[PDB]
Amino acid sequence: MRRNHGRGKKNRGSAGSIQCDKCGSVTPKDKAIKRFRIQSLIEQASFDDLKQATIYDVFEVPRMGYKSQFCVSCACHAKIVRVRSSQARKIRYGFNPNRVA
Amino acid sequence: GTKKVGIAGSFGARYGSTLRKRMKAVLETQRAKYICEACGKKTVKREAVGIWKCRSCRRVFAGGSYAKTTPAGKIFINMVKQYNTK
Amino acid sequence: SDLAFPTREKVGSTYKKDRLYREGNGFFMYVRCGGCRHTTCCYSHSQTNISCPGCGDIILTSSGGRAVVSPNCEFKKIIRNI
Amino acid sequence: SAALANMCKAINNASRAGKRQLLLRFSTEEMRMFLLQMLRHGYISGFSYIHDKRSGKSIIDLNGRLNRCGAISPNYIVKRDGIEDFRTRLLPARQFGHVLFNTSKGILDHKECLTENVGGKILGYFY
Amino acid sequence: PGLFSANNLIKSRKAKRLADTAYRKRALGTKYKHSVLGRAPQAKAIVLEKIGVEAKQPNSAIRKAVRCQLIATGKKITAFVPYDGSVTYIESNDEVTVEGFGKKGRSVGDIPGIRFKVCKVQNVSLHAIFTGKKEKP
Amino acid sequence: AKMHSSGKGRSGSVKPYATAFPTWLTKSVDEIKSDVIQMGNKGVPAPDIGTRLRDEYGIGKASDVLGESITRFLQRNGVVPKIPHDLESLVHRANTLRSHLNIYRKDNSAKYRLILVSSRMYRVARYYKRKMRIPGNWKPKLVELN
RNA sequence: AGCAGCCGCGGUAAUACCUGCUCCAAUAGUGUCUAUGGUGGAUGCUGCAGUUAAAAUGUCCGUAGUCUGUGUAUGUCUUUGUGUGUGAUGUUUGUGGUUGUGUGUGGAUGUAGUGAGUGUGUGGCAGAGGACGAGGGGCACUGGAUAGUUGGGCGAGAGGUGAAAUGCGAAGACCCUGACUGGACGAGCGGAAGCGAAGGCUGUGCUCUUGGACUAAUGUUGCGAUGAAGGACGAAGGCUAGAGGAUCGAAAUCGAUUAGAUACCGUUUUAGUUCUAGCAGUAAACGAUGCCGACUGGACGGGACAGUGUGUGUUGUCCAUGAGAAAUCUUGAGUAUGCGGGUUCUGGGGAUAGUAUGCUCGCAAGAGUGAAACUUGAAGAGAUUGACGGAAGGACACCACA
Ligand SMILES: [Zn+2]
Ligand SMILES: [Zn+2]
Ligand SMILES: [Zn+2]
């Protein structure tokens, strides 16, 4: 099916394992599906009422980053990842750390 | 000699094979000879339980029942010796 | 364009052991230390630290490749006589 | 004779790609006797070799006329009556090609060995 | 495969040959050990019982056979009586000559478990009684 | 194509074709010979002598000044070690592993190295016995494992 | 009822069974059962196959042997076949008979290769220099989360589920706070990045050990490749002794669900999970892919060293040529059935069966080696079009919603 054989591991024997965030099953770290997100600490449909409540003259709402980790059954079921066709299976998407802002 | 039984070959075929293996382990360390620390010669033997003595220079020291040092004596003799250096 | 006559730009970008005729990369040189005028013979990829006798210094140190001649010193590649 | 078989595979590779010259980084004495028998029969243009106090080097000039060359390992021993069976196994037709032997008179192909009453060890072939 | 390596090649190729089953029965000398008639091509027997066997599906039929006793070795066997209406010439305590089927010791067609075939009945050809050339015993 | 690994590196030296005799020598030829014969008496091994000639005297090939190789020159002057330097480095490496294993028993990494280091030393000894450089009954002198 | 080596025929519409005609092949002969050569490149010297069809061994070291480094051809003579190759010859022709010539195994004696160690230092090993690495053993410290003990606050539920039940809570739970104790683990950074023979290896600082690459006018001088027999290492679970005990959890046990669930889901509670010393010897121990040597197009990268506009050792992705049964392969699964570079192992239709029995090893649990009788016409690989999914999407519709 895949030339990966399903996981990003090259030229090493073993690679460490983790426990899935939803069911808790044991999986290699290079095979798990991993996602990163930055969420506002306060909901967006609440910003107006928070501008009259604040006592400080200048306030910044905080943001946190979260890394998640799931197994193949839990990501497929939750629709985090979907079935693709034979040729579209080969397309990888990245981040580009050299972007300007 | 004997293939598997060693110093436990004085017991014939009595007592069971698990119990003759406990006799063989403790009997090897009990009847061996050890190097003295003061004179440096290989002449330390056991007198009674916990009493080891050198046949030359006659010095006496205190140890285990069947072995010259015990596994929990080594652990605390180091701690006192690291505490003085540091 | 024959393989028996390569341009001399190519002969520079060839591995030392793949060259057509046997030829290495090392040579002997002259070094002058400082105010006082001595002159020592050294090797270009020396594995020892050298020091000038007059005005006791250290005029050559070893590295992983070519030996590093001190700042206020200058070398010259030896030529043999005929 | 490990150098003779290495040379024949590198020649088959270049003759198929359309090269004009071939440079190998090794050269032995009986590898040069095999090549001198292809030159006098018309199958290569010439060659030349260098002395470097390493394993040697050699440069072959190809022609456009070679169909194939090979080496036979191990070097079996053939009497003068068994020369003709090795010919029907290795050459495509009865009019061209040359099988070479190492006899007590040098290196000869299969037509000369019959006109001198000798046998020897087989080395290779080419057509 | 060097020129002085012929003892390594005879030792190696003799061992590979044993993986052939037909060759292995001959080389180890056990080709006639478990065989109900040994080295004979035909054999005589006396008839004990007269039974009927089902065909193996997808065929509907009942093939007529007999249970016998081999006069030469005292082994029991079953044999198949070929033609149409021919099982009724034989009786019990008759003598019969049986031979092979012709397929290396396997059964043929839809007949399960039978490896032999009645040929004569009291020294008269069974195929000739069916064509009318000879008379019943 | 290394002996005990799958390494395939090609680094190393390449000496010239047809060298000559050095003109830039500062000392004499007879004053240099009496020093190559001095360092051989202090027990300096022959690969380390050639590194002093190159770096401090300007001699790149000592077969052009001494008239022959380094260990044939020292032989005529009566300096012949008891064991050659190749073989005795290997006995010494196999003794420093044997005495580390006497304190740290669970070093399975060093126990595997001791096997390979020491089968390489019995192969080099078998060569010097075919060639009559050590006796036919030589045994290595080894620390004793416990 | 019968036929049919094999594929197959016969259920009132038999070109295949039984009977009659007609025709086909060979012919004084023509069928059947059994053994054997070819058929069979389906035993493979010539001349097979081993990623997925049967098949490369979990990993290194290593002796015998093979290969490499430093046993030949031919003239003359001689000694042995009853067979056979090939001429002649009208027993009326013929199988024949008679009759000319050649050939088969060892040995003796010449000639040719044939001349000999030298010099050089190409593979390997040993030593140098400055760098690089979650390679290993030991010692000393450190970080928070889970659980628990104990001071202060609060006053009725908390937990977990598709939804609940058993079970815990007014001797004050849960939640918030000040102090402590203990075992285990080392997040984020963390990747188609590095190291180790493989199994494997991520806190910090010390220490004893280790590897491959690179750089060079250092030493030596062929000291090498492969490898039945022998040896060491080897995930997790298990077993033997001691120590330890947070979390999770086989077995046991209740509560649900169900037609029934000795199961999936949950509650109470264990062996085990950790360390030291050993035994054992197995894995989808996988790239399901022996080791060494020669040669071969492009494009975009990474990691180490050295140089200066490049090189050597390694390694990831994508395109040709070529190969393949195809899927696919790109330092090989390429270099022609145009078939020979050196040297090993394993397979020979399915099932019985990795089973019996013997032997070697183990405390055991078991491991290693390893059949037959009897049965049977397929079992299998890769791909094509359909049908189906208690499969995923995109469009739609007042026999769908709003
Ligand atoms: Zn999950
Ligand atoms: Zn004393
Ligand atoms: Zn100075």
Which string of DSSP letters, residue by residue, matches chain C? --TTS--TTGGGSS-TTTSSS---S--EEEEE-SSS---EEEETT-SS-B--TTTT---EE--SSS-EE-TT-EEEE-----
d(CA A41, CA F133): 83
- The answer to the question of whether C57 is labelled as a binding residue is yes
CA torsion through residues A81, A86, A88, A91, sign: positive
Fill in the DSSP letter of residue A77.
H
Radius of gyration of the CA atoms of chain A, in A: 20
| C-alpha dihedral (E35, E38, E43, E49), degrees to nearest 10 | -20
Q: Is residue C71 less than 8 Å (CB to CB) from chain F?
A: no
H and E: helices and strands count for chain E: 3, 5
d(CA E106, CA E34): 14
Token pair 């070398």 is at which residue? C75
Fill in the DSSP letter of residue F143.
P
Question: Is D75–E3 a contact, with Cβ atoms under 8 angstroms apart?
Answer: yes
Contact between C24 and F13 under an 8 Å Cβ cutoff? The reply is yes
Q: Is residue C16 less than 8 Å (CB to CB) from chain F?
A: yes
User: How many interface pairs between C and D have CB atoms less than 8 angstroms apart?
Assistant: 14
d(CA E98, CA E117): 5
Residue nearest to nucleotide G391 (CA to C1'): A83
Token pair 């000739």 is at which residue? E128
The alpha carbon of residue C30 is apart from the nearest alpha carbon of chain D, in Å, by: 30
The alpha carbon of residue D57 is apart from the nearest alpha carbon of chain E, in Å, by: 28
d(CA E126, CA E85): 11
Residues of C in contact with D53 (CB under 8 A): 22
Say which of D21, D48, D53 has its CB closest to residue C22.
D53
Q: By what method was this entry solved?
A: cryo-EM
Q: What share of chain A is helix, strand, coil (3-state, %, to 5)?
A: 20, 20, 60
Contact between D111 and D103 under an 8 Å Cβ cutoff? The reply is no
d(CA F26, CA C41): 9
Nearest to D110 by CA among A40, D97, B11: D97
Buried b / exposed e along F130-140 (16+ C-beta atoms within 10 A): eeeeeeeeeee
Q: Is residue D48 less than 8 Å (CB to CB) from chain C?
A: yes
Residue nearest to nucleotide G46 (CA to C1'): D89
d(CA D47, CA D94): 29
**Which parts of A1-101 are beta strand (E)?**
17-19, 26-28, 33-40, 63-70
Nearest to F48 by CA among F58, F60, F57, F39: F39
Which of C18, C28, C39, C59 is the best mutation test for F, with the most CBs of F within 10 A? Answer: C28
Query: Is residue D61 helix, strand or coil?
Result: strand
